[PDB]
Amino acid sequence: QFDLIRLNNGTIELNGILTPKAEVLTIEKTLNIDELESVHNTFLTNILSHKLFATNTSEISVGDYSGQPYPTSL
Amino acid sequence: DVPMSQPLKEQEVREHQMKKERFDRALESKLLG
Amino acid sequence: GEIITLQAGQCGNHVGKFLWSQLAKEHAIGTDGLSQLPDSSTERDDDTKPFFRENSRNKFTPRAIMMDSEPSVIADVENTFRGFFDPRNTWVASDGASAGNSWANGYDIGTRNQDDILNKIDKEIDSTDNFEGFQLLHSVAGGTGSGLGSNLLEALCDRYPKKILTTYSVFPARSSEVVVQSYNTILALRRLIEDSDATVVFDNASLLNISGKVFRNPNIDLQHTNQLISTIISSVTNSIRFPSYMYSSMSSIYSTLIPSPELHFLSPSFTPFTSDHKGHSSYDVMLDLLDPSNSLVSTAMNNPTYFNVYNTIIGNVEPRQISRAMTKLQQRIKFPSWSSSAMHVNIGRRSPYLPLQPNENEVSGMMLSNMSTVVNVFENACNTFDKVFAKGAFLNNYNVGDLFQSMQNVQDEFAESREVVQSLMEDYVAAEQDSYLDDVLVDD
């Protein structure tokens, strides 16, 4: 039941306020349309966020000794 | 009429409590207050 | 650390019946192997796993191998524990009854069945991931009992060289049967001295000295007093079953109990208790425990040397009481000049399901110690042995299997077994002397 966010620093964050139990003093985590699209975009982005595919940016380390983006060599 | 000292337990308690306080104050500072 | 109980001979199986009964009470599990608890509360605040193969089902299977030559003792237990025990872990020496009360007979049947016995042991080890060890329940002078224990021990000490196999040795009061029973004791004891892990001594004489006061007399019977044996066993594992945060392992337990590679036979004591417990203070329980009147071994010494003293108090213990008791105990224990006296005191827990728990504002507990006089439990057997197996019928006509390949393997096995026992006694005595380490630690 716990909605937990894993962070890269090891933190597991509860996603929001911890709610009380059903016993109180006095539902489903479904996705909406944008959320579904977002998940999909996130996914494709993640594939292409892998370092080896970053051929459109100066941020890709261009190999090391070859001096080229990994896909050039591949 | 005489140069009498303060209470012994009270001083012991204060030494204990002051130690506790110094420590907690140091921790509060690291947490930036 | 998973533990497998080995129930050998009728004594071992009768003792197990009491042990498992107490465990079923401690962990509210029925005789059918089911939790007695509602499942409305899924957290039990205990761990039955080391003793039971809790199933995916509401089933707790005792981690035990039931072994005998006489299937009726096992059946008496299985027929009580109607679903609790797994019958596939039951072995009976069906290929001939033991030829009388000789460890050799028990040994010979175990030897022939050694592979089958081990297969059952491994079927249960296969149900344990973190297997740590075994608990062997047996009489010391029974044919099937000590013989099976001798076979089990030889098979297991080599097959599982890194696992812990402890022994729960039940000693008959010495009587005329000793002309056979002392060699069963002595030769099976040789095997224990050489191969067994820490062993605890239960002297039937003391079970009776005590049961004559605490059991419903006339039934103060040794198979009835298995509750006293069970009380000690369950007390020892209480730190495992309802673990606290200090001692959670057998290896941790023995780290302060075993001073050398020598097998030590330890002497338990216990007071007060409830079974089918209102002590006043832990102060008093600890002090009361350092008294032979609460002992299950009739060492009867006024000034024995103690080594490795440990006790566990379970209940609402006040640390001030504990400290005061240690203060005085520290001043009145005999121990060698070469070792500071360190008493180890552990605090345990009452089962959350113990029916007594809601009204327990009282404490009780157990003491275990390494006594230079623990060996007194073997004295009458030894003196008998020296006079009887030097040359009597008792030496050769009770031997079967390898023990009687020739008389030579009798004459020397018996003499050597006596010597192994003599050495055990000599070392308990050597440890009483300052010279034990004065000829060690300043030898440079």
């Binding site: - | 506790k20 | 890194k162 640390p319």
Partner: protein, 317 residues
């Protein structure tokens, strides 16, 4: 929120209250994994232990949020460096620590102050458990591996090396556990009862917050964290060293005794005996110096039940 359940979970995690069971299973699995990062190692490859942790965490009942949120992280200062700073202890092993992202609203009571104190307590206890566990393994080797079987080395080895090793070891086992029993019984358990009895049927949120931090401070202020750490550290170095000496040197000694070595007939084994004797004599001396210094420090509090029990286990007959 069942705050009490949350709290027992927290206690089980950082005090290890009633959880020696879980301390041991994790500690044992990773016992040898606590040997390298502090030896000046810029260890960025302990991900395997991190993963072992996560895998173990995954086995826990999901209802226990406090376990579900637990994380392993590393520091730059080891426990005694941290303590010397905070307790103004007249001034190097283990950078590991755990935390929990305590969610709102419960984090209003379980403050960061509480959590940092919890890390300190836990690290302290884990260190003691580490050394205890090393000693537990050590007697298992000494009294089980057939080095105990050596005879063919004479009494000139049996006494001054074998009995000497085993007794020094036992003294150490008794010392470490005595201290641990003290800490857990005279420090941790009483604070836990305080928390439960201060609770019972509480009237003030503040009182709860107060006792929680209060007890944790009382622990932080324990003489064992304040005054005695420098010697505990000497003992810890001693335990580690003797435990690593054992098994390795145990095996080496087999070359002298034909019961295992049988080939051998070398002065090298005789050199081994002399090395073992000198090592052991020094081993005894440094252990005793620590015990002496320890005893002496305890004796100067200018006056203790939890101290007297410790001294009892130390002071020679």
């Amino acid at each position: 929120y069942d705050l009490i359940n949350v709290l027992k979970h927290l206690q089980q995690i950082f005090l290890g209250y009633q959880s020696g069971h879980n301390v041991l299973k994790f500690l044992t699995k990773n016992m040898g994994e606590l040997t390298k990062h502090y030896r000046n190692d810029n260890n960025a490859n302990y991900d395997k232990l991190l993963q072992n942790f996560e895998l173990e965490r995954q086995s826990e009942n999901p209802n226990n949020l406090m376990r579900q949120l637990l994380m392993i992280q590393f520091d730059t200062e080891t426990l005694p460096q941290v303590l010397s700073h905070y307790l103004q202890i007249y001034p190097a092993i283990y950078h590991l620590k755990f935390d929990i992202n305590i969610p709102y609203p419960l984090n209003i009571i379980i403050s960061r102050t509480c959590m940092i104190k919890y890390q300190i307590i836990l690290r302290y206890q884990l260190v003691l458990q580490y050394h205890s566990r090393l000693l537990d393994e050590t007697w298992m080797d000494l009294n089980k591996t057939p080095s105990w079987k050596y005879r063919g080395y004479s009494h000139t080895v049996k006494r001054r090396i074998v009995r000497a090793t085993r007794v020094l070891h036992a003294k150490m086992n008794h010392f470490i556990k005595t201290i641990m029993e003290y800490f857990n019984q005279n420090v941790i358990d009483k604070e836990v009862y305080s928390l439960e009895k201060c609770y019972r049927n509480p009237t003030l949120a503040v009182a709860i917050q107060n006792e929680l931090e209060g007890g944790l401070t009382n622990i932080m202020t324990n003489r064992c964290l304040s005054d005695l750490i420098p010697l505990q550290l000497q003992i810890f170095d001693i335990v580690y060293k003797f435990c690593k000496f054992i098994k390795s040197m145990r095996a080496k000694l087999c070359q002298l005794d034909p019961v295992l070595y049988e080939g051998y007939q070398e002065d090298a084994a005789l050199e081994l005996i002399q090395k073992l004797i000198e090592y052991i004599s020094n081993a005894s001396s440094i252990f005793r110096k620590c015990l002496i210094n320890f005893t002496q420090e305890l004796s100067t509090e200018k006056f203790a039940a939890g101290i007297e029990r410790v001294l009892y286990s130390i002071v020679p007959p």
